[PDB]
């Protein structure tokens, strides 16, 4: 299991002060949001089980994200300075961080990475005690964060508060977070030539998002020949995916779709059944 | 670090005064606190950055203004005796672990109902006892600063061209001369101890110097006695072999 | 109190250690404790920080015994020096705002090791500029405590430690004075429990 926060800060010179958006996830379930462009910005719930928290939870999260809005304004100014960039251009800082939970209920792995204009900028290393800077400007940040002991702060959070509250959320949302929804599956067939047809393997309504959809021909994986779409949200917190191969007419019986998902008791093997 | 002015202030009830704070550490988070006698510090206002003061969070009797990134002001709009306090500004970094607040030196502010309560210290030096010199071969001078109000003094000893610290002890707190009164005047004592041979030389020069903070020379004063302005009051002694 | 320091005043010899207690209450899931000391000038000096998500803090001669379930964060100062005398404050900073909540503080007095006590009360020489007589109680062992006067026109200071650095010599003293014509040093400290061997020249 995991917890992640995703932050986006966007400058917009001439059209207001920088905008700050935060979203939080447990596994693939979004549970909170904050957007500084609201009239009176507040942290809001995005899954029902987080509403077991009291009003103080929402006020405190709102204080933190309001402060982040101001701090990222300063970060945007600092980075413009590092790169000698005009005040007239728009720029974006992104950050994603959080914890992966181990079998003993303690930290398995911690994560913290930031980006500038969609490119790697600085990352906390897996030892949670050192940084990887992507360029010369990020080495300015690195020296500042080394002096300020940011890595110690993040290590404590990732080993402590992060795992403590991830476990709390998993227990409070156990009935939805800790039950996998298996995919509903089928295979479709459509001619594309006198001599070729598409076989498409569908996986619908599954949770969590992690899944393996593979076509085999005579039991051999067809990875390089398989079109896989990006896993996509259904809108009801479950996911959808398909995988397609173009095959010679008359060979369809040689092809099997294999589905692996946490919700399935055993992996599925599917065939086209006209 | 964090600077504050003024370090000492006396006001009459109803007077207004702006306290100034500045920090050069590139901090955003800045704070005003007050400390009453014998107590801890209590928050007046937290300014997370430049911006507009949230007046709903300012206690009655104060105005707060974050002037720029460095500068932060606290005004007493119409001073009351209950506002007698030490006012501290502080600032800190955000992020990482080194988030402790750095304090300025404070503004020691006393509000009195009537400026006729304000008095500079009388300062006198009391010379070593012959009995101490013959019993110990050491010689203790005592400086007494008495009858001052408010308790806004800084005492130093000067010997042969230097402000000295070795052999000195000054009371850590002044004493109220009339403990039952809110505008009681104060006293303060200090000791300087030297060898008998150093005291017995009439070429050696010892001075107790008390900087007092009171009225300004520009202030109105309608009492018959001399205006109790900020001033240094000193007393001295030269060594002697008898 | 939301932050409570258990001691109001503590005395301890040089070179020993002292523990100053602090208990707090909070419902925040993230916070820090800070210890400060305050000088006679009123200056506030940071000593050591204890984060709610971190192990026991240590910084030179300062350490915090962080008992998180008990919300206890006692400061221990080891290898005490005379310069450690000060008023010590425990402060709680909650969450992101860090709006500090202070205890009322503990006065810590570090006592010199008076190797050769020579308690005495001396009458100092009058000032031609003053109508006061002044009495000095000095050179007593650090176990002696000085009390205020039972007479309202007699003033008595707390005991003070001076250090004659050129001679490596420390001594305690207290001062008494009065306007009164019947004021005598022989009776100035009658309100205190003074050593039986005090010298009255």
């Amino acid at each position: 299991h995991s917890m992640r926060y995703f932050y986006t800060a966007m400058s917009r010179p001439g059209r207001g002060e920088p905008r700050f958006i935060a979203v939080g996830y447990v596994d693939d379930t979004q549970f909170v949001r904050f957007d500084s462009d609201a009239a009176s910005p507040r942290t809001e719930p995005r899954a029902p089980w987080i509403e077991q928290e009291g009003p103080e939870y929402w006020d405190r999260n709102t204080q933190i994200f309001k402060t982040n809005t101001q701090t990222y304004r300063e970060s945007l100014r600092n980075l413009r300075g590092y790169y000698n960039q005009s005040e007239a251009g728009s720029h974006i800082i992104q950050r994603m961080y959080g914890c992966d939970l181990g079998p003993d209920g303690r930290l398995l792995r911690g994560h913290d990475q930031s980006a500038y204009d969609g490119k790697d900028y600085i990352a906390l290393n897996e030892d949670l005690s050192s940084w990887t800077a992507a360029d010369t400007a990020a080495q300015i940040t690195q020296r500042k964060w080394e002096a300020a002991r940011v890595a110690e702060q993040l290590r404590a959070y990732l080993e402590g508060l992060c795992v403590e509250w991830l476990r709390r959320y998993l227990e409070n949302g156990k009935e939805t977070l800790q039950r996998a929804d298996p995919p509903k599956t089928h295979v479709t067939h459509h001619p594309v030539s006198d001599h070729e047809a598409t076989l498409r393997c569908w996986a619908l309504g599954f949770y969590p998002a992690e899944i393996t959809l593979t076509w085999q021909r005579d039991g051999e994986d067809q990875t390089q020949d398989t079109e896989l779409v990006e896993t996509r949200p259904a809108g009801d917190r479950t996911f959808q995916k398909w995988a397609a191969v173009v095959v010679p007419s008359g060979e369809e019986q040689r092809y099997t779709c294999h589905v692996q998902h946490e919700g399935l008791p055993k992996p599925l093997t599917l065939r086209w059944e006209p | 670090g964090v600077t504050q002015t003024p370090k000492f202030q006396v006001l009459k009830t109803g007077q207004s005064m702006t306290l100034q704070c500045a920090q050069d550490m590139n901090h955003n988070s800045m704070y005003w606190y007050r400390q009453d006698p014998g107590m801890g510090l209590r928050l007046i206002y937290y300014s997370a950055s430049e911006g507009t003061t949230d007046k709903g969070e300012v206690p009655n009797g104060y105005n707060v203004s974050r002037l720029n990134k460095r500068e932060f002001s606290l005004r007493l709009e119409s001073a009351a005796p209950s506002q007698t306090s030490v006012y501290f500004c502080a600032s800190r970094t955000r992020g990482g672990t080194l988030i402790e607040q750095y304090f300025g030196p404070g503004t020691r502010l006393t509000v009195t109902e009537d400026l006729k309560n304000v008095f500079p210290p009388e300062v006198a030096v009391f010379e070593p006892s012959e009995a101490e010199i013959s019993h110990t071969q050491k010689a203790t001078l005592v400086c007494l600063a008495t009858g001052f109000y408010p308790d806004h003094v800084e005492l130093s000893w000067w010997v042969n061209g230097k402000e000295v610290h070795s052999g000195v002890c000054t009371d850590p707190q002044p004493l109220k001369e009339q403990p039952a009164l809110n505008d009681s005047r104060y006293c303060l004592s200090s000791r300087l101890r030297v060898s008998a041979t150093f005291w017995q030389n009439p070429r050696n020069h010892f001075r107790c110097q008390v900087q007092f903070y009171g009225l300004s020379e520009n202030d109105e004063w309608t009492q018959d006695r001399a205006k109790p302005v900020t001033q240094i009051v000193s007393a001295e002694a030269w060594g002697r072999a008898d | 109190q939301k932050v409570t320091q258990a001691q109001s005043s503590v005395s301890m010899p040089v070179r020993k250690a002292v523990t100053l207690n602090c208990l707090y209450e909070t419902s925040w899931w993230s916070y820090y404790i800070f210890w400060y000391k305050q000088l006679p000038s009123k200056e506030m000096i940071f000593l050591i920080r204890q984060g709610s998500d971190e192990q026991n803090a240590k910084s030179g001669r300062y350490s915090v015994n962080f008992k998180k379930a008990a919300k206890s964060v006692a400061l221990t100062i080891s290898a005490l020096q005379l310069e450690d005398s000060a008023k010590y404050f425990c402060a709680l900073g909650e969450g992101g705002a860090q709006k500090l909540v202070f205890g009322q503080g503990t006065r810590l007095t570090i006592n010199p090791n008076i190797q050769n006590p020579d308690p005495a009360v001396y009458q100092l020489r009058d000032s031609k500029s003053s109508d006061k007589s002044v009495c000095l109680f000095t050179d007593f062992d650090s176990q002696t405590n000085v009390s205020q006067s039972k007479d309202s026109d007699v003033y008595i200071t707390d005991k003070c430690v001076l250090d004659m650095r050129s001679m490596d010599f420390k001594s305690n003293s207290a001062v008494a004075w009065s306007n009164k014509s019947d004021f005598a040093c022989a009776n100035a400290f009658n309100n205190s429990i003074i050593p039986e061997d005090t010298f009255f020249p």
């Binding site: 935060a22 933190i64 994200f65 701090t71 990222y72 300063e74 961080y97 | 992020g95 | 899931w29």
Partner: peptide, 9 residues
């Protein structure tokens, strides 16, 4: 809960 306080880059 998020990290309680962010540092400036």
């Amino acid at each position: 809960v998020p990290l309680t306080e962010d540092a400036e880059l």
